[PDB]
Amino acid sequence: LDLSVKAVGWGAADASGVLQPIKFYRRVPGERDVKIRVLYSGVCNFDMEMVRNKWGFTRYPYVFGHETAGEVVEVGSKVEKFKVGDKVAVGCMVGSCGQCYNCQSGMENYCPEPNMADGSVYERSYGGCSNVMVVDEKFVLRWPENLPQDKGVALLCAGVVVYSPMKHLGLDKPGKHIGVFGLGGLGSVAVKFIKAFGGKATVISTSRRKEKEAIEEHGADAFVVNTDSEQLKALAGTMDGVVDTTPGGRTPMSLMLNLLKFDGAVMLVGAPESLFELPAAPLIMGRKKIIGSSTGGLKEYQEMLDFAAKHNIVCDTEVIGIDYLSTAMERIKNLDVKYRFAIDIGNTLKFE
Amino acid sequence: DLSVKAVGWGAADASGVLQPIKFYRRVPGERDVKIRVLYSGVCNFDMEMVRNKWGFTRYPYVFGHETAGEVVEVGSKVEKFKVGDKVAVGCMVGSCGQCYNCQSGMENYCPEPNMADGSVYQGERSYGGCSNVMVVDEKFVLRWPENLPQDKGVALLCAGVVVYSPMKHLGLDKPGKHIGVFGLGGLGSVAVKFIKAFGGKATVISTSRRKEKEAIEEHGADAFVVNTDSEQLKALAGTMDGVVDTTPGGRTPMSLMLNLLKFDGAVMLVGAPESLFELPAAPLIMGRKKIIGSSTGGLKEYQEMLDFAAKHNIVCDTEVIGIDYLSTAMERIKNLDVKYRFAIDIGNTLK
Ligand SMILES: NC(=O)c1ccc[n+]([C@@H]2O[C@H](COP(=O)([O-])OP(=O)(O)OC[C@H]3O[C@@H](n4cnc5c(N)ncnc54)[C@H](OP(=O)(O)O)[C@@H]3O)[C@@H](O)[C@H]2O)c1
Numbered sequence: 203l204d205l206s207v208k209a210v211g212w213g214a215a216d217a218s219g220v221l222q223p224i225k226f227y228r229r230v231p232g233e234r235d236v237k238i239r240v241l242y243s244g245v246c247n248f249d250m251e252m253v254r255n256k257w258g259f260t261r262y263p264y265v266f267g268h269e270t271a272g273e274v275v276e277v278g279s280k281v282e283k284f285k286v287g288d289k290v291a292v293g294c295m296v297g298s299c300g301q302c303y304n305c306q307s308g309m310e311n312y313c314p315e316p317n318m319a320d321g322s323v324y325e326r327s328y329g330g331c332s333n334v335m336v337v338d339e340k341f342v343l344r345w346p347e348n349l350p351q352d353k354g355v356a357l358l359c360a361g362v363v364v365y366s367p368m369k370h371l372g373l374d375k376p377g378k379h380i381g382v383f384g385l386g387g388l389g390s391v392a393v394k395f396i397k398a399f400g401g402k403a404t405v406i407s408t409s410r411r412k413e414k415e416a417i418e419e420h421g422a423d424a425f426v427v428n429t430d431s432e433q434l435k436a437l438a439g440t441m442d443g444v445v446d447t448t449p450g451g452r453t454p455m456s457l458m459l460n461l462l463k464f465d466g467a468v469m470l471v472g473a474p475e476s477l478f479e480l481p482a483a484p485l486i487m488g489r490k491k492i493i494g495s496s497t498g499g500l501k502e503y504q505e506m507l508d509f510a511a512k513h514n515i516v517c518d519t520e521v522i523g524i525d526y527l528s529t530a531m532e533r534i535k536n537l538d539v540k541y542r543f544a545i546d547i548g549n550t551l552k553f554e
Numbered sequence: 555d556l557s558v559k560a561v562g563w564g565a566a567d568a569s570g571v572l573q574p575i576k577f578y579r580r581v582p583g584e585r586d587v588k589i590r591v592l593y594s595g596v597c598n599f600d601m602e603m604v605r606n607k608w609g610f611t612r613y614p615y616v617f618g619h620e621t622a623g624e625v626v627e628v629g630s631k632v633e634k635f636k637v638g639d640k641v642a643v644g645c646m647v648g649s650c651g652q653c654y655n656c657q658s659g660m661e662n663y664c665p666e667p668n669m670a671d672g673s674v675y676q677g678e679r680s681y682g683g684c685s686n687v688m689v690v691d692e693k694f695v696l697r698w699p700e701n702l703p704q705d706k707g708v709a710l711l712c713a714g715v716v717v718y719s720p721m722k723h724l725g726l727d728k729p730g731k732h733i734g735v736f737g738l739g740g741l742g743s744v745a746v747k748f749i750k751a752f753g754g755k756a757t758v759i760s761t762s763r764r765k766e767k768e769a770i771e772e773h774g775a776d777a778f779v780v781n782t783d784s785e786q787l788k789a790l791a792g793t794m795d796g797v798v799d800t801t802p803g804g805r806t807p808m809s810l811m812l813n814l815l816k817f818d819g820a821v822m823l824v825g826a827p828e829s830l831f832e833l834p835a836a837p838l839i840m841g842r843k844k845i846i847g848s849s850t851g852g853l854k855e856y857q858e859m860l861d862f863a864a865k866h867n868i869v870c871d872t873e874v875i876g877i878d879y880l881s882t883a884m885e886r887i888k889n890l891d892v893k894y895r896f897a898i899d900i901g902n903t904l905k
């Protein structure tokens with residue numbers, strides 16, 4: 203009896219970054235392992251850049267996927283969390299050292315030795331844009347019954363990235379006024395989380411066309427175009443926090459600091475592109491802070507999903523077949539999707 | 555009503571030529587404390603303010619945010635201070651008293667602070683503590699601990715509070731923490747001494763190789779590194795819970811300070827802003843690191859800081875001078891030729 207787990211995934215074989223199918227094996231499920239039939243895989247800006255090795259974290263062959271939703275088809279004998287049939291998800295990590303202070307305190311995303319699903323080096327692994335995953339139960343998330351997997355799968359990226367810093371800073375309280383720069387996947391979900399927390403959300407966007415969806419769909423309290431200097435001046439000193447989802451350096455730090463109240467925080471989550479110019483005087487005079495954040499701990503992933511489910515929050519998602527992946531990447535780059543693609547792996551990814 | 559006849563030192567205009575300035579203080583109201591000034595600290599801030607370096611200076615200008623003296627009179631409703639008590643006044647003599655910051659004891663972040671030296675941070679016209687007498691609302695008067703000398707201690711009102719406040723806010727005032735300190739002057743040296751007394755570890759990064767001995771032997775630093783020693787700094791990557799930057803803003807690379815931090819580390823900027831920092835986002839994001847600024851402290855923090863310094867016998871290295879040396883002292887302050895602060899003996903030399 204051949205036990206091996208045959209898999210196929212999409213990514214790049216070479217540094218050229220040309221998208222291709224990649225055949226490989228998953229390990230046989232150990233006693234604590236969960237074998238997952240992948241139903242949906244999110245794709246985002248991060249994946250699009252990783253395939254071209256924008257940041258030097260990519261090892262080839264490279265199968266992307268840090269946004270994975272599926273169903274349990276097999277469990278190891280000592281698995282307690284999940285049974286066959288259960289809907290589950292996997293985020294950016296499939297392992298950590300488990301003995302460092304970060305791991306002990308539930309911040310596995312800041313383990314010095316993370317085991318990334320897509321194998322990014324910042325074990326040799328293949329990501330969730332594949333037919334099947336085998337993952338230790340610790341790193342598998344329970345999927346809430348009331349969330350659809352197709353529209354929800356992007357929460358694993360869009361959701362956790364914004365939820366984690368807001369919780370860390372204690373901004374997830376009623377009454378807080380939070381500004382959000384850039385209304386894409388992260389931006390839109392941030393607005394929806396802020397409203398559900400009982401806060402007030404202001405959107406600053408480069409796209410005037412997004413006013414309607416910001417106000418009418420996401421429930422933002424205000425929408426401001428980034429070039430509207432007089433309106434931005436008027437919002438000086440009004441925000442408990444600012445969430446910057448724009449590429450690092452594309453929004454002036456001086457603007458973001460000026461919008462903050464005393465003790466306010468700028469939360470940088472966007473991909474670094476260029477240096478910020480940082481004036482010290484606003485930080486010092488206002489005891490303001492700038493903080494960065496990447497993904498979230500395992501607990502935060504689960505809490506985020508449970509929260510989204512409670513308030514019926516999803517990410518605006520376009521569901522596509524695997525054969526459209528090349529075009530999807532182009533649309534991601536051109537900011538021509540509202541706001542994320544989800545790949546229907548379960549129905550469209552096939553062998554040979 | 556005006557009453558108390560007063561003399562202070564400062565400048566009449568932007569030339570910054572030091573002179574005596576004659577004025578009157580108000581009669582103590584019911585909540586006021588009249589203070590005979592015994593010592594006044596002077597520092598970089600004062601030296602620059604007299605020349606209006608930053609445009610905050612209103613003339614005539616009598617500096618002094620580091621004032622220690624004794625109570626000679628109190629208003630009828632003051633109970634906390636009695637005649638004869640040793641006291642101090644810091645940078646503020648008033649605030650709006652009704653904003654969230656004021657209510658939560660962070661008067662230094664009131665939108666409408668009343669500065670001792672009258673610097674426009676609006677704000678009421680005032681003359682600072684480099685004067686023979688002060689009249690101050692009891693709320694803004696500090697109790698001076700008996701076991702600290704006023705002459706060597708008065709600089710704590712500036713050097714001490716500025717570094718103590720952010721470390722407390724960030725929870726860095728705990729045993730085991732490793733804190734880096736850029737610039738070993740008044741703030742730097744006192745920071746080291748606080749860090750050690752908190753039970754932490756202090757590394758000093760300085761531009762002056764000659765300060766190695768005093769850093770280790772006098773202040774109790776665990777390590778000393780020259781700022782141009784790239785290889786040593788590389789080796790300290792990822793070791794520090796916090797970095798205190800006392801250098802002028804923009805003089806220390808932000809990339810260096812971020813690189814020195816551990817996961818969840820904080821950069822604390824307290825130095826006078828001079829030029830923009832270049833901020834790379836990647837270290838912040840990857841390490842969940844933070845950059846914060848801080849200015850002076852709340853009234854409670856001033857008092858806690860003094861009480862703490864007293865408990866551990868912490869003072870600032872101070873050169874005590876007469877008022878007639880003030881012109882030369884300003885020059886030495888600018889040339890970084892004092893270890894590390896001047897205190898003026900007002901009580902005995904200002905007539
Ligand atoms: N920290 C983490 O853990 C983490 C994890 C995943 C992703 N990220 C990063 O988070 C960022 C946002 O993710 P996303 O999926 O929402 O990205 P996205 O769809 O590529 O862009 C989000 C929005 O940012 C604004 N924007 C994009 N490019 C811009 C530019 N050059 N100048 C100014 N504004 C620009 C646009 O908003 P408007 O149309 O409103 O102007 C756009 O809709 C990306 O940089 C991504 O790499 C970070």
Ligand SMILES: NC(=O)c1ccc[n+]([C@@H]2O[C@H](COP(=O)([O-])OP(=O)(O)OC[C@H]3O[C@@H](n4cnc5c(N)ncnc54)[C@H](OP(=O)(O)O)[C@@H]3O)[C@@H](O)[C@H]2O)c1
Nearest residue numbers: 598737738739740741760761762801805824825826849850
């Ligand atoms: N945030 C606040 O509330 C507040 C309040 C008062 C003062 N301050 C500011 O805090 C800073 C420190 O005060 P201080 O009285 O300790 O200052 P200082 O005696 O003028 O300078 C302190 C030390 O900083 C270093 N330094 C000075 N100029 C430098 C330069 N151009 N480049 C690099 N390093 C330089 C030197 O250390 P090394 O010899 O070791 O290199 C010097 O001994 C000043 O900028 C002061 O204005 C802030």
Ligand SMILES: [Zn+2]
Nearest residue numbers: 299302305313
């Ligand atoms: Zn670990």
Ligand SMILES: [Zn+2]
Nearest residue numbers: 246248269359
């Ligand atoms: Zn993603």
Ligand SMILES: [Zn+2]
Nearest residue numbers: 650653656664
């Ligand atoms: Zn106030």
Ligand SMILES: [Zn+2]
Nearest residue numbers: 597599620712
């Ligand atoms: Zn001072």
